[PDB]
Design a protein around this ligand. Structure first.
Ligand SMILES: [Mn+2]
Ligand SMILES: [Mn+2]
Ligand SMILES: [Mn+2]
Length: 327
DNA sequence: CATTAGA
DNA sequence: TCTAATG
């Protein structure tokens, strides 16, 4: 957690690189497992040799560990850090729509900057086009303050369209968080579950609602169960307009809500931990359900859920307010 | 890890 | 169809 830090972070740097600037899936995969095992080890690594005893720790990485140990640095690391092309990739990459693939492609084409990308909006797609447009705003955080204002409106039309809806704005938001990166709306309806072969309109209806009113401003992607977009709070009585916000609404079979809800609400750790427990408690949890375990090794059969409580009751735990679902 | 775009 | 990008 800190005793083996530099080595971990170094490695991950090492790793993230092969994956992005290079196509080295494996090497990359390599650095990762190592970066992982080394992280687990209870002692201070004092030499490669030492590291080397480890699983996945080869001659290659160990060599790397020595240099870092020995001198507060690494050239390869230093060289990349400098590498304009490489740099370039990391950059283009913050463009929502922009992935390593495009990144490289763009690069090779000579498009290395924000401006470049502008100059050739043509060479970009709608997603990337939007991304382009709201680069600054997509990079900006979202004050809960807004989170509150946003939530409000959303719940408002949701309700207006059909009173039978159920929306929950999950994530860190839901978790108390002073700020968030985007808004996650979980969505369901009685008239939609496991078997009840859709009602795409279920989704449809709302986005359309949201739009009609000006909450939704763009479409990143709209599918029959997952919309992905951009929003903004009505820029008040002037002098102060609002930054463009990434928003995501999703349809869910009323029969799987709370799990999903539980789930997306995190924290990643909370979940893992709760989930770990459900194992002892003779259960199974995952993003959609909760199944009782059968000694044969495994088992099925989806226990009925109506609330975040059921799942809790199930595994006989303490109801954790989302506030304190931190871990 | 599943959904969406796109080509 | 596959391939990429988000989450
Ligand atoms: Mn070994
Ligand atoms: Mn990106
Ligand atoms: Mn998200």
């Amino acid at each position: 957690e800190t005793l083996n830090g530099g080595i971990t972070d170094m490695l991950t740097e090492l790793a993230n690189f092969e994956k992005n600037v290079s196509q080295a899936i494996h090497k990359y995969n390599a650095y990762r497992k190592a970066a992982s095992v080394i992280a687990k080890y209870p002692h201070k690594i004092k030499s490669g040799a030492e590291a080397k005893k480890l699983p996945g720790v080869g001659t290659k990485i160990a060599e790397k560990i020595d240099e870092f140990l020995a001198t507060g640095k690494l050239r390869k690391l230093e060289k990349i850090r400098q590498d304009d092309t490489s740099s370039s990739i990391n950059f283009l990459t913050r463009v929502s729509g922009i992935g390593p693939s495009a990144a490289r492609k763009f690069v090779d084409e000579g498009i290395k900057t924000l401006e470049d990308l502008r100059k050739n909006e043509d060479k970009l797609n709608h997603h990337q086009r939007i991304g382009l447009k709201y680069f600054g705003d997509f990079e900006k955080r979202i004050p809960r303050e807004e989170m509150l204002q946003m939530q409000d409106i959303v719940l408002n039309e949701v309700k207006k369209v059909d009173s039978e809806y159920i929306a929950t704005v999950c994530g860190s938001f839901r978790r108390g968080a002073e700020s968030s990166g985007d808004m996650d709306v979980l969505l369901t309806h009685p008239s939609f579950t496991s078997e009840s072969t859709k009602q795409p309109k279920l989704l449809h209806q709302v986005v359309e609602q949201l739009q009609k009113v000006h909450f939704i401003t763009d479409t990143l992607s709209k599918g029959e169960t997952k919309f992905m977009g951009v929003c903004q709070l009505p820029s008040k009585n002037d002098e102060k307009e609002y930054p463009h916000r990434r928003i995501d609404i999703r349809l869910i079979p009323k029969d799987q809500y709370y799990c999903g809800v539980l789930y997306f609400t995190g924290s990643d750790i909370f979940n893992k931990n709760m989930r770990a427990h459900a194992l002892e408690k003779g259960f199974t949890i995952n993003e959609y359900t909760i199944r009782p375990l059968g000694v044969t090794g495994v088992a099925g059969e989806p226990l009925p859920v109506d609330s975040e409580k059921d799942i809790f009751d199930y595994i006989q735990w303490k109801y954790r307010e989302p506030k304190d679902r931190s871990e």
